[PDB]
Design an enzyme around this catalytic site. Structure first.
Site, PDB file in Angstrom:
ATOM      1  N   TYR D 135      17.588  33.575  89.572  1.00  0.00           N
ATOM      2  CA  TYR D 135      17.056  34.462  88.535  1.00  0.00           C
ATOM      3  C   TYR D 135      17.860  34.165  87.287  1.00  0.00           C
ATOM      4  O   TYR D 135      19.081  34.431  87.206  1.00  0.00           O
ATOM      5  CB  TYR D 135      17.090  35.945  88.987  1.00  0.00           C
ATOM      6  CG  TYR D 135      16.546  37.006  88.033  1.00  0.00           C
ATOM      7  CD1 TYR D 135      16.805  38.350  88.281  1.00  0.00           C
ATOM      8  CD2 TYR D 135      15.808  36.676  86.884  1.00  0.00           C
ATOM      9  CE1 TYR D 135      16.326  39.369  87.429  1.00  0.00           C
ATOM     10  CE2 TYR D 135      15.306  37.700  86.008  1.00  0.00           C
ATOM     11  CZ  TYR D 135      15.585  39.039  86.299  1.00  0.00           C
ATOM     12  OH  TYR D 135      15.120  40.075  85.493  1.00  0.00           O
ATOM     13  N   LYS D 163      13.288  31.648  88.629  1.00  0.00           N
ATOM     14  CA  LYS D 163      12.542  32.541  87.741  1.00  0.00           C
ATOM     15  C   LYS D 163      13.135  32.360  86.336  1.00  0.00           C
ATOM     16  O   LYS D 163      14.257  32.719  86.082  1.00  0.00           O
ATOM     17  CB  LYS D 163      12.584  34.009  88.212  1.00  0.00           C
ATOM     18  CG  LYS D 163      11.924  35.007  87.215  1.00  0.00           C
ATOM     19  CD  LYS D 163      12.047  36.469  87.682  1.00  0.00           C
ATOM     20  CE  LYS D 163      12.423  37.403  86.547  1.00  0.00           C
ATOM     21  NZ  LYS D 163      11.338  37.914  85.670  1.00  0.00           N
TER      22      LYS D 163
END
Lengths: 292, 292, 292, 292
Positions: D135, D163
């Protein structure tokens, strides 16, 4: 000439069409010497609106300032530019006029490597034969030089030190520690006291054009360890500086000069040329409160 | 003339002493027109090493570039400067020479207000009578213009649009939404595909001096919705650009021109003026891999 | 208790599995009181590795520190978190243990508005009834609070002032000018002298766990105007701090504690838990040069 | 399970006192599955207000979301934290609940080294046995990971990809070129079209809670080369997003959920917990203009 102590960064008087007003410029030089009682002038810096001017105009200012000052004070010439050939031309000219040292902003706009930066200083020095003061102003240039890098610049014996208009007091301490014989001038007038506490050798300041009396007191009182008094005077100084920044830095210093009969003129486009009547009234309040 | 499509940001051939090489400059111009098959040239931008040069040298470049290209392609003259009087003088010269539009970098170094910025653009337009393209390059200038501010600049009907060398694709979309009749040229060659996918009207890039064939393919294919082929071409292009950046941007594009018989010359100090031998060999590897 | 003067930011001893080593933590508390001669401890701050711990672990540290120190010194409890409910739970517990004041880091990660930040402080104060010190550390949080904003925070009479781990000395001066009765503690140990020159009321520092003797000397000498000597001691201090930062801050301070028989333990993952043998040897050199 | 496609970052319903409203959270899950027609849910990320909650609260959210969604969609659990022991405990819990992958924000607040960051990822993977999605959210964390660093992270075969809540489309293209078999999910909804043009595999977004119909249209039209159509829908989407950002991101998405009958509840302090009355009315106008 001793280059320690208090230097005003010289403002320039402009006419409405942006040309230099010689009479006005001369009045600013005289005011700094006779009334602000400066040790010297730093000519052609950011404060002189230098980077908005032609090479011819920059030469004109160097000529005028030196002709008016003669030998009464020290004179440093800021000749730096993105154009190294212009810097060399200006360097030669100021050296021939008798300026005591050159200074040169780190080249900016492009992202120059450190070796390119060092070559820039070394080239100006070689072409002129003059002393050099590294002009460091990270908040405008985005250029940050570290202590090791200063050491490499200082391998050239004609580099005297640095005009430190930067707010990193850890770097400031480490530079004094590492290069005790090289000079430092503080560049942020609103942080003069803590800079002087770390043993800087002088200060170069735009607000000293009008607040030179207080500036000297803070510097000398701090070096003498009279901190309680130095702090009181830094507090008043910073009330005045806060107002000047809020109102428009160069225009308000000029309006403050005008209030004392100095024909400080307009600012140079693309800066705003003239204060609104509201801001003129604001500058009068600053005069009444702090400089009367 | 039509100002849409592929514009090379014109590189300049310098001699060893930093003077302009007229023969070599006209060869770069010719190579762009004949071999890169560009729609036009953007002259005197960052890529032209413009900010390291004198006013006279900038005029010389404009003169030579126009004298060579004649009427064959579109020409845009970047005339911006921290000195507005210089910008006006250059803007008039380029207009008199027949340049199809002017362009000007946001004034930099000093922290100018937005009304000062708008006045700078309006002044250049009024003095020249020519069209204007806003040159936005935040990674160099630290200046960020918002959608509402662009709207204010676009109140002047002679402002055509913006050269967007900026990495904010949200802003890019918002600007195209808000001002549908105003033009946008992408300025980051390595992000051409995502920029064309948002409907930009053309691109201005340094690498088009040597990769102008692939650059046109990415642009035209993306606009036709051929994303598969466009992406493949963007990947190869970015292998070449990653190599160029790592080896030295302007020097490596000049070397790649030289490898095609173009006398692209040296870079201008304070930039590094020639490649090391090992980096010469690296550029020859890029030539073999990507451009033969 | 008087909250002025010299506060160590309390390091904590961890076992290899990351659990608190109580015996070691008590040795650290004792070393600070008995040998570093601190005025107080700041418990649960960045230095305590606080933000890598569970709520129960934070409580156990508060419990242990207070049981060891008893009433011999002042104690401040940092209870700030992105979780306001956790901050309130810790605040209540520390207040019930008898901590002299709370402190809380500005909530971070998310971009909170200033009214959210002010509500956060007011909420901890209301729930606990205890004093509050605003913990300002822009280089970690990205949060910058201005003079006017501090004034809004200070409308709550339980807010005593600010731990100023920030490097803007103009802001520092303006804060002391605007709110002369509110306290400021310096948070950057390597900038203690210039902070003290501006009249800060004390200092909170990680390096005081080992260099507490010199830290007190710099602070007291500066306030007495003995700048020459204060500067000499700051130069040595900064040779030590430069080495500590290069070697790994928390691990190196712990290594320097170990060399004096304090079982300061490991650091807590995801920080590196233990020094390499090369870095242990480096820490021994720091000990021999600066702390022998 | 297939992890490509459109994933809403799950919003959480809170009661006035900050506790989880289970009925409201199930309604949000249902609305995403049944009306937004998402491929999956990303649970416990920034959008879920994760970082303001206790470990127990995070567990409750994971349990409730899985219980409601069952096997109808893909589910990803964000378990990252500055506390690695918390991350492992959360990762084990979500894994044993049957989450298809974990995800973890780069450790933040402290300035962790790259080997510390890699050890943090490997440690969570080793302890859980589950797949991991990096992330990356530089604008919140200040952490920037480069292509070579992603390569080092990708040496663990259980790392699936990233992400990419980041604005750098050059980096995006390079990562897809360098690691063609690794997945990328776009994190900025307002830049979905250009991210999809570069071949991302899906998108994880907060606005998909309310705008998932258009989001899927932009993604799918872009992948088919229907750019003129995708751009039109992106324009309308960004009018809605501009309004949402100006009105308060999480509160305004929750208000749009409430206007469709979903009991999306309050936000969690220290975020502002409910909209002011005027901002309730503005959210109503957004509903009428864009989602009616």
């Amino acid at each position: 000439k001793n280059l320690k102590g208090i230097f005003s960064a010289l403002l320039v008087s402009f006419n409405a069409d942006g040309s230099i007003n010689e009479k006005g410029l001369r009045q600013i030089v005289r005011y700094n010497i006779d009334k602000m009682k400066v040790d010297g002038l730093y000519v052609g810096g950011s404060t002189g609106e230098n980077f908005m001017l032609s090479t011819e105009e920059k030469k004109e200012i160097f000529r005028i300032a030196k002709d008016e000052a003669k030998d009464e004070i020290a004179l440093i010439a800021q000749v730096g530019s993105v154009n190294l050939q212009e810097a060399i031309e200006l360097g030669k000219y100021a050296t021939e006029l008798g300026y005591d040292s050159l200074s040169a902003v780190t080249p900016f706009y492009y992202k120059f490597s450190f070796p390119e930066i060092k070559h820039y200083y070394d080239s100006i020095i070689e072409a002129t034969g003059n002393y050099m003061i590294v002009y460091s102003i990270p908040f405008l240039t985005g250029v940050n030089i570290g202590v090791e890098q200063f050491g490499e610049l200082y391998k050239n014996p004609k580099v005297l030190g640095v005009k430190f208009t930067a707010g990193d007091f850890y770097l400031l301490e480490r530079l004094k520690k590492a290069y005790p014989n090289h000079l430092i001038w503080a560049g942020f007038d609103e942080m003069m006291l803590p800079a002087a506490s770390l043993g800087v050798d002088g200060a170069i300041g735009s607000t000293f054009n009008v607040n030179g009396v207080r500036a000297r007191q803070i510097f000398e009182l701090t070096q003498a360890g009279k901190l309680k008094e130095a702090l009181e005077i830094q507090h008043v100084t910073n009330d005045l500086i806060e107002g000047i920044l809020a109102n428009g830095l160069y225009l308000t210093i000029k309006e403050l000069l005008k209030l004392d009969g100095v024909e400080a003129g307009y600012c140079r486009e693309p800066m705003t040329k003239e204060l609104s009547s509201e801001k003129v009234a604001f500058a009068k309040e600053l005069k009444a409160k702090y400089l009367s």
